[model samples]
Target chain A: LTTIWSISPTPNCSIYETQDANLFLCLTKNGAHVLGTITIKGLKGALREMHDNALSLKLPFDNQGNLLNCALESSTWRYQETNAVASNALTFMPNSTVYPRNKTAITFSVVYNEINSGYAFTFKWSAEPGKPFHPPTAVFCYITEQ
Target chain B: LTTIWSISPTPNCSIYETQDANLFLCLTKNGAHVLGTITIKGLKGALREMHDNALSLKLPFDNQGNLLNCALESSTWRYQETNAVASNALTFMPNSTVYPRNKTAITFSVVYNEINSGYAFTFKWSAEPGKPFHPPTAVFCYITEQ
Candidate 1:
């Protein structure tokens, strides 16, 4: 479960997936984009309830492009450090079961990490019965580092 | 011979080597970087005289990251259009016999193009006799871009 999807449409963002089925978002802070809440809409996915949502993320970054020292206090979803002393391994995950849902859209934070980047995040809508998997428009990041 | 050497060190620059043994420098336009002459120092090479000199480059870029419309006016080096109207090909070449030498440093332009990018520019110093080759740091752009 390793993939890093990226796109450079209105805002620049990248998603990094690790071998352990973990995902982190790398957002490019540039040109009226740095230091702000990252909110994105219209992300495609499988299921009727999928992609019909939005994401609001606020993560931090150090000099080395790693998702460091994160914790969501008083929230259903939280982050925990697995082994920061030796491996610097950390993960922040969401609790969908107990967390509240939004019919309009979903909100969460996207963070950053490096190594093994790609755009293999694809899904097929089950309602179509025989529709093929599709790559979301958010992965069209090659259009511009510009 | 298709290699693209690049670096984010100092100023942003890249070298595009085509299948036809053609090379072009891709200069990135960034803060205090756009619309200025590019000069770089300490590029590695095999020969003792190599990497021991500085480079001055002046190239252009369109929105699509290509080396288009080039000509060295009144200089020993000149550019020729291969099939720019459709394929959009152009190359700038230097004339060793007709061109003069520069002891202070070498001066030329680096341009930009995309596809099959890499950092394989390596060489061995003759003075080392049995030393291994070295990769020019230009390909080190992966450190940041990765």
Candidate 2:
């Protein structure tokens, strides 16, 4: 099962291509602040764009269209979001690449601080990105001999 | 944050209505003798579609379509295909009522009999119901929360 995914900008993110495991870890960050990680696992079929479940993730809080205090972190890397309150919409820009096979996990993290709103933080993980694809496609799993 | 979801063609196999939960569970039966429950916990989200995570559960899966299956248990309901052999694509329609809110859970039990080549033996329940209209809205929680 092959799969593809996109990330919501504003968290200043990147996709690190890993080997030995079929996964895609989205690394989201905001400056030096670290949020957390989101890992997408299990790819065994061709992915579709219309189903809306292929590659999707939602943060604990809304970005609100501006890069505020959000920063992303992983085991070894950190990315930053310039505008924390930016639109939460996931943008498929011309630069974003389709994740390859034999990958492992994506991470999303944030570090936000607002004057009146105080400080907020998030460090969590979601294995299933949820439906964000279109038209939809077959998603399968492997069955081993018992 | 309340939402409504439904499926076309009324109560039979059709598109999802706003009354339906943001997530769904589907059961598929293979061959003329296959009998089992194919549970689907979550569907990904798409942008700019009439529906959020909408997909069709039609038979004979086709291209530009979607299908889901489950062999294990977890709130992270992710699906992966076993082999490259593609089946028919599922067809998706739209509805006008029903939507589950965050932090809520809905369950469905389905049995597919190849003999009928369609869905058979099914039951559904949710934290909320149609009357008081507790449709899930922006504050909904994922299955893992339960």
Candidate 3:
């Protein structure tokens, strides 16, 4: 089932569910930027904006936007997020790419530093024995209500 | 950010987003059936109904839903759904358990037969070098919308 939910200030950047239950963030800036989809179960809310050519997302810890938990899996990779804080941030890995034998090397990391105050995220590719390595890319951050 | 979407008929079934963007489907029939969570990436639509014993799901190819594309991974196991039809049914393999290291053996197949008029899915585990073997289970037809 599909439903359209509006993002805060930029109401144009709406979030909707695809037929497969994946959530897609569709933004309209220079043009429509249909950011890649994410299979987030029980997606309650999302706050996103384009920054420095990359997209920044936040699932705040509030009555209206609290992110309780999440888990992701593929043949090669697995990710889980059980305890979340308001400082958490969501970003993509650096140089994500696909490999042969149906092996996908793309990865998204949620890094939380105690002294830094909030979470920082990045996306990159997992190194295989013989495949070339790709560097991680830093995504922009969009601060939201705490 | 989270936004609540009510599941029709089953009003108590709440869908919430985890901090990591994964969505969780929480249902309350006789009791709470939090059938676990799924990523939003490969999710099409889920048709889950509380049965006498379990929750049945169907990813139909229609206006309210679409057959989602999925990619699964593991060094030893792989999953693909590139050739699903309206009458396709998905089921898990028998004795498809995980083992330590290279001893792990499990397999799931998506079979498309023209004479059958649709797709039939089954799963099985690969036998270890010296372990006893188990046969595949009976393939069941997961009825879906045409």
Candidate 4:
């Protein structure tokens, strides 16, 4: 049993905080998607937020909503739907300065694609340049199997 | 990300319960054997005690120190590790009814034999014939592919 967790944002998403502190998943104009429902207990499914992202998300899946499936491909994860790769648009690698870099309302990354082969619960594009963090942009996507 | 668990008693194996509800991982005395180190909070690994019998034992495999490989292969599933054999050792199914049973101690019942082939945690000899608060006689095994 190895433990490594911390990303608690479950109030049905819509959360925000950042003078540079870190933490998002808010109602960026309602195209929103914060963990449909999140949990790190025992490690399984039930990561909520039925409406869901984009962007190279890394490190245990770049924390974001503090996700967990304990990936290798987290045990056969499922939930699928959410993609907005508008002309090479989103892709991220937020490095946990708490959880930085979200280009104004464009947070999303829960991808292991191949059209659901890698057990999708998909999303992508966190190119992380700048401009997307107004009072919006949400993110959510559960995963498993591996 | 919490690692709060540690209990290792391995010798002639004398054990009992309390502090954490019910847990025994040391073998000894006449009808030797008791287990309930139980665990979850990330499923590390400690609960490993076994000897000959357990016609008595109980308390908290709950938060009372969880036990889940999924419940060590689903609680109440045995095959090898001996549980004496009072001809199917009377069954009320067992859900804690103030403990309940006979024989004082004896547990085993997993036989997926082949992955680790046939009967080995063998302890047998607990026959719940009477009842009045006695817990510790629920082991189900038959594994392979550790």
Candidate 5:
């Protein structure tokens, strides 16, 4: 039914940031989805710039001066067209975002049809001032039917 | 069967002193198969540090006194064993970091067992500081038994 996969960070960066940021992409038989979410904790200020499809927020950085953390999720969908002509006529809910470097959670979801074959999705994330930015990781899990 | 996933940063890091960073994690069924990789680009001097399991780099700042960009990735694995009864083992690889902006790519893969619930696998990736890290988006593919 479904399969899962993993990808680890190269020698590049460590997994310890004072701020919070994360992105995610979801794909199914229907189509593809891209979601971006970020939060600034401990300090209140303007949000950062992002692509038209992305979202940003300002919260409080940790007391230790760490950047805030943000997580993103997506939903499921159904397909409408197939054959020589394939398309989708469905609505999408905006992704979610939360704040506070220490504790917070965000989620996004979508649904679509299996018009043709396979699925597609994308996600992006970043931090704010006095803080460094960290990209998001991806994991794929497949579901099997009984 | 085997599964693999990866991510890369955008608008990679340019100089040293930047405070942004990224992290990556990879997990597999076999301990000897785990691996991690990272790279720092656009830097001017020797990297801050490098080791068998970790690395640190510098960031370049723009004329506006702002540090350029940076990205990162990482992977790790550990095992637990006890006497008497069979023991359970769990693995985790969370990518998170700051400063030293640049591109960071993280990836993970796995191989499953046919008879037992356990599995065997390997993990590898590429990281270039000062350069941008661009990991492919998440994907879902199905496998049907004939």
Candidate 6:
């Protein structure tokens, strides 16, 4: 019964997913607004389904004028906390140079917690010319249920 | 009980959506592939939802250093015939000049019939200079239902 409510791309430079059943507040980046949330009812089954279909969820990027194949990595757990929290992490490496300043080898991470029913994300960049700077993060969450 | 299965963008220049319950067939452009489709269970409700949210779904484009807000329009109905067949139309005015020949306004139209459960689309360009060559049509379909 895991239901993903909404997945919307916001004008404020972020995407949102709404999850209503499992109290899973979807990923948020840079603290702009409540972009979107994903509600997962069955965590175990949902994770398995996503992992099994991970190959189809590859992020597309240009690698020297060719398509680069990027895979999705996800994990979930029942953390031993004060309030019995469910923690999860999903990540993907977009190795793209589509921007102006030549952003190469960037990774996106989404961390979720059921106790607080909230999630946060971070973007890291590497293999640049100079000191690495934080680039604008565009997040999108996809859900699968069993 | 309408559900949006997916909304994904591809590098091949198209968007795809999946709707299982409704017998809705979306559109494909440029003779590429079946980019996407949407199933509409309640025709009237679906139209109202899309129309009301048209402003938010504007296609982003650069218009002489400014942003132009463009929208997609769609309609569906059950034609009173021998078999009571369902029909639909979707169009979008992508007022963009991103091409080499300065295409000011381009409109895409898609017509659907339940008898064949197939859709065909066309792209029309206006406000172009000279011989008025046929512009390459790129189509996108969007649906709003709850």
Q: What TM-score does chain B get in every candidate?
A: 0.20, 0.21, 0.18, 0.18, 0.21, 0.19
Fnat of candidates, each listed: 0.00, 0.00, 0.00, 0.00, 0.00, 0.00
Ranking by TM-score: 2, 6, 3, 1, 5, 4
Can you write out model 3's per-residue Cα lDDT over A1-51, one digit (the tens) per residue? 011122122112222322111222221111000123222222223212211
Query: How many residue pairs clash in model 1?
Result: 11
* TM-score: model 1, chain A: 0.20
Give lDDT per model, in order. Answer: 0.22, 0.23, 0.21, 0.23, 0.23, 0.23
Interface RMSD of 1: 12.7
Model 2 chain A worst lDDT run, 10 consecutive residues: A92-101
Better structure of 1 and 3 per DockQ: 1
What are the per-residue Cα lDDT tens digits for candidate 5 across A33-118?
A: 22222222221122223223333332212222222232211111112122111122111211111011222113322221111222
Answer with 2 or 4, whichever has the higher TM-score. Answer: 2
Q: Write the per-residue lDDT of candidate 5 for residues B1-146, one digit (tens) a residue.
A: 11111122332232233423222221122222222222223233323332123232322223222222323221111121211111122121111121112213255332221111222112223344543433332222222111
> What's candidate 6's DockQ score?
0.01
Worst 10 residues of 5 chain B by lDDT: B74-83
Off by over 4 Å in 3: A4-105, A108-146, B1-108, B112-119, B124-145
Q: Write the per-residue lDDT of candidate 1 for residues A62-99, one digit (tens) a residue.
A: 32233333321112111111212211111111112222
- Interface RMSD (C-alpha) of each candidate? 12.7, 19.7, 18.1, 24.9, 12.5, 15.8
Q: How much is the lDDT of residue A31 in candidate 1?
A: 36
Task: Go through the candidates in order and give each one's DockQ.
Answer: 0.03, 0.02, 0.02, 0.01, 0.02, 0.01
Query: What are the runs in model 4 whose C-alpha is more than 4 Å off?
Result: A1-6, A9-117, A121-146, B1-22, B25-146
For residue A66, what is the lDDT in candidate 4?
27
Estimated TM-score for each candidate = 0.19, 0.22, 0.20, 0.18, 0.19, 0.20
User: Which stretches in model 5 have alpha-carbon errors above 4 Å?
Assistant: A1-55, A64-146, B1-108, B114-118, B124-146
Better structure of 3 and 6 per TM-score: 6
Every prediction: chain A TM-score: 0.20, 0.17, 0.18, 0.22, 0.21, 0.20
Error of 2 at A59 (Å): 5.8
